[PDB]
């Protein structure tokens, strides 16, 4: 087990208020976020902002499987932002995708804490994008590719927090029994690591 | 879990702690910190900062600094904006916040319910606020404290006003910074700063204009010395 | 004009649904999980004076205007 | 005791008059709702029959009304408000309200500065006097001694309490506030 | 300099007076002069008046 080629760039776009891409390997997304502006009145709420998010893909139009991966994302957001020191406000959070390789998920949470950390939100800790996928017979492999993913009897995804590591959203894919949940759950865990180190060695690079 | 007093001038990440001295302090935690317990949480990226002048006394704020664009008010900033509507017998104005401003047709210099004054929509003001607590649209007025306007009501009328990062503003407006006065060695010129991220110059000729509007963008980075003079060289022609 | 008796699909649609030891055991609530005030007069008890009232009484009683 | 189906003939307009709910036709009371039959005797005889359900679901608000409502957000000139009961009972939906800069006090003066009147977030009990125009639908007052903001909130999620006509303090921290206190 | 001002007050009216007629007919062309006359001609010392005025 071993994460690829990591690479990352930021404030790329001069409209944005922050943008980040994210490439992990092969794979990329790209992400903007717009700060705390004015909200319709028929969406806004007292003593909270709102969260946006919106996916786009690179070949066809959204469906039903990109709201239900939108949902998921602004969901997980939503726990790590301190929302009540702006209310009457919006934040949107929007995702394209460029280039797809396998485990696009993973990084495209990265791609929108990446975000969300350039344009300078109010956050209560960092999130991750961790995915795992055993094989057909139990072999355990991290940051998997869609010629391994194609194989695959199994494939899991985790957020994972920046504070003591727990677990923010989980989606999976097949059929497996728990051991080897929990084994690929210890494997994330143990990967979170070196990634928040990056994040870490990021911005200490960006301060110089 | 760090201490304060030791981690100075270091980058912080989001979700941290940090210990402030021991005996609890009335240390107010200022806008990227958030005071929880005895311990403070850092919730924006940036670099410690500590400023208590000169004695052994309170004396002393924790704020970190980074770099954004998006503005929120802050009660008591000189802030540029520009006018949007008319309405009633206010005139709403533009920040760049989440909600528009309001003036009052009675807050200028010498103005009365006949001697009003000349405010069209689309024009620049420059003024400070008064009220900025996360209540209310954030209301200012353009005189003084006394009542005598310092350089305040609308201004510009043959300038650019462009827009920069707050952390260029926050750079300029330092009590030992040269960024301003070898600037205006090579090119004579006047600046309006805003806090909001915006603000007005005005040089002689309309290409010495352009050219300090394209160059003054760029000094919050490209640092002093080994690459100012050089590059203040470069550009002279 | 004879009213009938419902059959299965109706007499289920129509369900309402409205200490006894210990059971479920996990799932209890133990097993899961100064204050000085020195407080002000509690209520204000309106003893006094009450502006609009007076205001209104004031210039009624006055009624001098001089 | 028996109920009611929106029509039926109850009465004659001889023996007795029509009440709350009800409507008459061609000489005879008919029923217009399907509540309990009330028969409020008075004095004087000629029984005003009325029929009233007693478990009010939803009720449309009038000309003149008591509701509790809560504060969504405040102008220099107005305050939303969302109506949140009708007197005492609860609401299944949620109406607006907007209290103009006339209804603070009972004199309809000058000042009254809406800013520290009305505080979002608070629950205060207010008057109806209209049905409104499109922009503003009911058009709530609260020129009274009894109307006002009745249970504030602090700063910080601590139950407030009121200290004068016009001042509120906090209990923990001490702090001094305004609001425009409702006697109780 | 006691009869100038109210001679300016005095004209300021009929310059006031004559954008009506100018909309009337259709001419702007004299309808935006005057209205440079009108915005040309107030100053602050006729807007004195008295002491207490505010």
Same mark, same amino acid.
């Given at each position: ?208 | ?237 | ?29 133990? @097993? ?32 001098? @205007?001089? | ?184 | ?54």
């Amino acid at each position: 087990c071993s994460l690829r080629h990591f690479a990352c760039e930021q404030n790329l776009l001069s409209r944005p208020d922050g943008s980040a891409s994210f490439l992990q390997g092969d794979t990329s997304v790209l992400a903007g976020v717009y700060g705390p502006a004015e909200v319709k009145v028929s969406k806004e709420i007292f003593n909270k902002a709102t969260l946006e998010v919106i996916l786009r893909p690179k070949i066809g139009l959204p469906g039903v499987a990109e709201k239900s991966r939108e949902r998921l994302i602004r969901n997980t957001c939503e726990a790590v932002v301190l929302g009540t020191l702006h209310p009457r406000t919006s934040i949107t959070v929007v995702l394209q995708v460029v280039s797809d390789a396998g485990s696009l998920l993973a990084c495209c949470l990265n791609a929108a804490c990446m975000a969300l950390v350039d344009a300078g939100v109010p956050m209560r800790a960092l999130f991750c994008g961790v995915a795992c996928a055993l094989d057909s017979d139990g072999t355990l492999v991290l940051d998997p590719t869609s010629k391994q993913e194609k194989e695959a009897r199994a494939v899991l995804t985790f957020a994972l927090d920046s504070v003591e590591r727990k677990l923010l959203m989980s989606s999976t894919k097949g059929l497996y029994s728990d051991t080897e949940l929990q084994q690929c759950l210890a494997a994330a865990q143990a990967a979170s690591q070196h990634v928040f180190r990056f994040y870490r060695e990021s911005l200490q690079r960006r301060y110089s | 879990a760090r201490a304060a007093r030791t981690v100075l001038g270091q980058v912080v990440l989001p979700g941290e702690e940090l210990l402030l001295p021991e005996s609890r302090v009335r240390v107010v935690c200022g806008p990227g910190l958030r005071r929880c317990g005895d311990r403070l949480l850092v919730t924006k990226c940036g670099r410690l900062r500590h400023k208590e002048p000169g004695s052994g006394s309170g004396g002393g704020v924790y704020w970190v600094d980074s770099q954004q664009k998006r503005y929120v008010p802050v009660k008591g900033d000189h802030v540029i904006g520009i006018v949007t509507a008319k309405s009633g017998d206010i005139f709403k104005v533009d920040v760049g916040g989440s909600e528009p401003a309001s003036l009052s047709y009675l807050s200028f210099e010498g103005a009365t319910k006949r001697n009003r004054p000349n405010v069209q929509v689309g024009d620049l003001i420059y003024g400070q606020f008064v009220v900025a607590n996360k209540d209310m649209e954030p209301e200012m007025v353009c005189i003084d404290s006394c009542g005598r306007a310092n350089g305040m009501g609308v201004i510009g009328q043959d300038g650019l006003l462009f827009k920069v990062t707050l952390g260029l503003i926050r750079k300029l407006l330092a009590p030992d910074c040269e960024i301003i006065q070898e600037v205006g060695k090579l090119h004579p010129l006047e600046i309006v700063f805003g806090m909001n991220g915006r603000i007005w110059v005005k040089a002689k000729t309309i290409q010495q204009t352009l050219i300090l509007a394209n160059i003054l963008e760029a000094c919050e980075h490209m640092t002093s010395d080994q690459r100012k003079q050089i590059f203040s060289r470069l550009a002279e022609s | 004009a004879l009213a009938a008796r419902p059959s299965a699909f109706a007499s289920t649609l129509c369900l309402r649904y409205p200490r006894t030891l210990d059971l479920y055991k996990t799932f209890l609530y133990s @097993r899961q999980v100064e204050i000085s005030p020195l407080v002000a007069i509690t209520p204000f008890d309106f003893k006094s004076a009450s502006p609009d009232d007076i205001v209104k009484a004031n210039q009624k009683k006055a009624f001098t @205007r001089e | 005791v028996r109920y009611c189906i929106p029509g039926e003939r109850l009465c004659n307009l001889e023996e007795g008059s029509p009440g709350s709910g009800t409507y008459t036709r061609h000489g005879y009371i008919f029923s217009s709702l399907a509540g309990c039959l009330m028969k409020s005797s008075e004095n004087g005889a000629l029984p005003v029959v009325s029929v009233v359900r007693e478990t009010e679901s939803q009720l449309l608000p009038d000309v003149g009304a008591i509701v509790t409502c809560k504060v969504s957000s405040i102008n220099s000139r107005f305050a939303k408000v969302h109506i949140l009961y009708v007197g005492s009972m609860p609401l299944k939906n949620s109406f607006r309200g907007t209290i103009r800069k006339e209804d603070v006090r009972a004199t309809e003066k000058d000042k009254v500065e809406i800013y520290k009147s009305f505080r979002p977030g608070d629950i205060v009990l207010a008057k109806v006097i209209s049905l409104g125009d499109a922009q503003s639908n009911y058009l709530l007052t609260t020129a009274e001694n009894e109307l006002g903001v009745v249970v504030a909130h602090s700063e910080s999620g601590i139950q407030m309490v009121p200290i004068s006509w016009c001042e509120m303090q906090c209990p923990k921290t001490h702090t001094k506030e305004f609001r425009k206190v409702a006697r109780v | 300099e006691g009869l100038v001002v109210r001679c300016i007050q005095r004209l300021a009216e009929m310059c006031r007076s004559l954008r009506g007629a100018a909309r009337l007919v259709g001419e702007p062309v004299l309808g935006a002069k005057m209205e440079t006359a009108a915005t040309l001609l107030r100053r602050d010392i006729v807007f004195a008046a008295s002491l207490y005025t505010q």
